[PDB]
Write a protein that binds this DNA or RNA. Structure first.
Ligand SMILES: [Zn+2]
Lengths: 146, 97, 53, 225
RNA sequence: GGGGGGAACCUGGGGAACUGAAACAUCUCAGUACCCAGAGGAGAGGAAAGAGAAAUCGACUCCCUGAGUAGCGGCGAGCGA
RNA sequence: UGGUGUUGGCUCUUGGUCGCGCCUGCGUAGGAUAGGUGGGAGCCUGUGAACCCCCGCCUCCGGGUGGGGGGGAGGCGCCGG
RNA sequence: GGGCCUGACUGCGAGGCCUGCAAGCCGAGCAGGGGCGAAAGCCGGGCCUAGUGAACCGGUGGUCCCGUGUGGAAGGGCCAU
RNA sequence: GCCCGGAUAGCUCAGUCGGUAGAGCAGGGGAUUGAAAAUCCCCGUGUCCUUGGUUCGAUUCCGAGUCCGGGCACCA
């Protein structure tokens, strides 16, 4: 199945490209996420002359990924929660940290864009990647306390 | 398992034909049938949940017609479906057929 | 008949057509029999090799 | 690990580039840097099994434009075939006592042909054979018109016979033949095998067709062009 | 606009067994009985991606014939264009 | 219960496929390890030598193998055998 | 018991016996081509009467008969089995 | 019926990715011996199952086949 990549993909390629992926991956993962489009002749036709626009909005992702990158690199977020001497009685997630930047710091990031492979259960400082734009990894210091 | 919501493939009535012996083509004396009994072949229906107009719509569609529904989804983009409920939305997408 | 006394044909050595069917005791005669039989196809007597029936 | 007369030839070759019968023939003589008239060789790969002892592409073709090479027919013939073999190109007659002229140690020829009446040539044979020179009518080298045979023997007539590694081997001429002269030289072996295809085979009858010269580099050439 | 009813008559979905095979399982009974849905005074079918041997015909439906023929068949019973 | 659809992504490893790049081939004889099938009387190194050392492979123990360094214009070849 | 030989034949078959049928049995003679024999002659298995099983289905070889528009082929038919 | 294993000396087996048929065996061709023992020996010997080919030669390598041992499958 052919699809028009709406983004640069590490295992697929880049926006504007039409690759062949099995129906499960794009059809359940990519299309609903808007990561790409089906390869219909209509979308092939409109494909031309939009890749300029598509890379335009993509470049917007680069720009706000930059002014937001430099803005959020130099700050540590603290998480006021209820935890033990060696254990967090609750848990933190991506949307949690987004809530912390929003209600506590006011900055607005995307929770899903944030990387969280394990909701934290221990205290202390943490450094994590965000990556708003492809090939744009952003570490970040979040502090969890009681 | 009922019809395919798009193709309308209903279950069919087929025969279980239990045979025996070697086929004539293989030098066998001939496939002696040991017994026939009715059965029903069912469509391989599946659930197809799709986000149209902020709504989730489920389609018990044949697997062979899975992508077809997505066509309708894209074909729905020339439509004004909000803020209709999933009943009217589904009836409209069927109207696209 | 027996597993020791088997059936057999007699191909003509020349027309190559099995013109006769007979039997032998393969115990006694472990050799392919060969006998001048009238080949109707060849239309004349001709040595016939014992062919596996 | 190679020669500056040869590495400089590998300098001017592209390993995976597709070449045609005309284009590569331009390349066969231009990279002919060996210090004599090289041999333009169309080394093709046949798509057949020699172990399948019916896919034996054993034949010949009198290539147009000759070959530029030397063919010396040690002719075997007697009874009015002596003198008609002595003429029309052959020079080694003869004509049946010359088998006794095979010591062996007398290898001043390049081919040996004998009429169908002999006969007394197959047995004596044992050393005339192991160098691939036993006169066999499968490829040219036997016939009552032994003089007629040698007439086209001298006319650059190559033999072809597939080997254990599914390969067939007959060069199209010397390094003195231009790409347009070799162009008939080249195709005269390809289409010579297009008709000698032993029917019954999986896949293409021609895996690949490469062209090297005497000491020269190989050449990835495209057949049927 | 629909609902529901309508003797039989029609499709469309489902669909038996007894019985015959002098047993019986393939098969036949029979796509019948019956059930369900739908209509309509009819229904269906209907304008060739047909027929099939003539370069032949020319949507469809039904009658006779083809023909118990071609055929199918534990090559049986039978069925049967 | 195995294939398959539904049903995807990453990677770890294994069995094929084809690329390629390489090495690999030994009665006697023949210097030596001769895989065939074609041309070959010529080749090579200042797009650095026979030589010496080092390194690994094969190694049939005769040897070859490929890579480095001194070396670096000295080796062979059909023909000899 | 010895000699040679394979008639333990091909195509057939007057006639008969037996018999519900079907089966079963005897066979002159004729032709092809042979065996033995001088020939006369005999030889179409065995001194005889048991040693066996209809049809269907299918296999194997010959056949070249049919081959679904045509040529092939699939597939069958027929012969042997 | 298909697929699996084997066929090599008078036997069992080895058996170059073809340059060699061999290990033992049975003996014996010999010599001792009136006979016969221990004995000497080279070993004797063999299509490496048959049919054709690869080959600069083919037990090998290849196609076909035969027989045998085995499994699987049908059985009118
Ligand atoms: Zn005959």
């Amino acid at each position: 199945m052919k699809v028009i990549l709406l983004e640069p993909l590490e295992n697929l390629g880049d926006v504007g490209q039409v690759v062949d992926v099995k129906p499960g991956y794009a059809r359940n993962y990519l299309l609903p996420r808007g990561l790409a489009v089906l390869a219909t002749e209509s979308n092939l036709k409109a494909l031309e002359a939009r890749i300029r626009a598509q890379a335009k909005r993509l470049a917007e992702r680069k720009a706000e990924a930059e002014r937001l990158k430099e803005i959020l690199e130099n700050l540590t977020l603290t998480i006021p929660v209820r935890a033990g001497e060696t254990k967090i009685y609750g848990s933190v997630t991506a949307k949690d940290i987004a809530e912390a930047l929003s209600r506590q710091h006011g900055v607005t990031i995307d929770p899903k864009r944030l990387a969280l492979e394990k909701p934290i259960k221990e205290l202390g400082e943490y450094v994590l990647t965000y990556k708003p734009h492809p090939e744009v990894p952003i570490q970040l210091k979040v502090s969890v306390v009681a | 398992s009922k019809v395919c919501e798009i193709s309308g493939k209903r279950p069919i009535v087929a025969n279980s034909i239990q045979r025996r012996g070697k086929a004539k083509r293989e030098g066998g004396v001939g496939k002696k049938t040991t017994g026939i009994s009715k059965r029903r072949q069912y469509p391989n229906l599946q659930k197809v949940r799709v986000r149209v107009a902020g709504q989730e719509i489920t389609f018990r569609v044949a697997a062979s017609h899975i992508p077809k529904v997505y066509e309708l989804v894209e074909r729905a983009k020339g439509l004004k479906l909000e803020g209709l409920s999933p009943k009217e939305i589904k009836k409209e997408l069927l109207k696209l057929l | 008949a027996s597993e020791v006394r088997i059936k057999l044909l007699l191909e003509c050595t020349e027309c190559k057509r099995r013109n006769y069917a007979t039997e032998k005791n393969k115990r006694n005669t472990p050799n392919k029999l060969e006998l001048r039989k009238y080949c109707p196809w060849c239309r004349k007597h001709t040595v016939h090799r014992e062919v596996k029936i | 690990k190679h020669g500056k007369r040869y590495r400089a030839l590998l300098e001017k070759v592209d390993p995976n580039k597709v070449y045609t019968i005309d284009e590569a023939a331009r390349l066969v003589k231009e990279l002919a840097t060996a210090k004599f008239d090289e041999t333009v060789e169309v080394h093709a790969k046949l798509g057949i099994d020699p172990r399948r002892s019916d896919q034996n592409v054993r034949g010949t073709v009198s290539l147009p434009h000759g070959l530029g090479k030397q063919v010396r027919v040690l002719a075997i013939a007697k009874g009015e075939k002596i003198k008609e073999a002595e003429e029309a190109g052959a020079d080694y007659v003869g004509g049946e006592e010359i088998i006794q002229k095979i010591l062996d140690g007398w290898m001043d020829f390049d081919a040996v042909v004998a009429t169908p009446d002999v006969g007394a040539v197959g047995s004596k044979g044992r050393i005339l054979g192991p160098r691939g020179l036993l006169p066999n009518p499968k490829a040219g080298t036997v016939g009552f018109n032994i003089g007629e045979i040698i007439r086209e023997i001298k006319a650059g007539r190559i033999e072809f016979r597939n080997d254990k590694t599914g390969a067939i081997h007959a060069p199209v001429g010397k390094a003195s033949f231009p790409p347009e002269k070799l162009a008939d030289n080249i195709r005269a072996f390809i289409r010579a095998l297009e008709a000698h295809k032993p029917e019954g085979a999986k896949g293409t009858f021609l895996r690949s067709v490469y062209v090297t010269t005497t000491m020269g580099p190989s050449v990835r050439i495209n057949p049927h062009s």
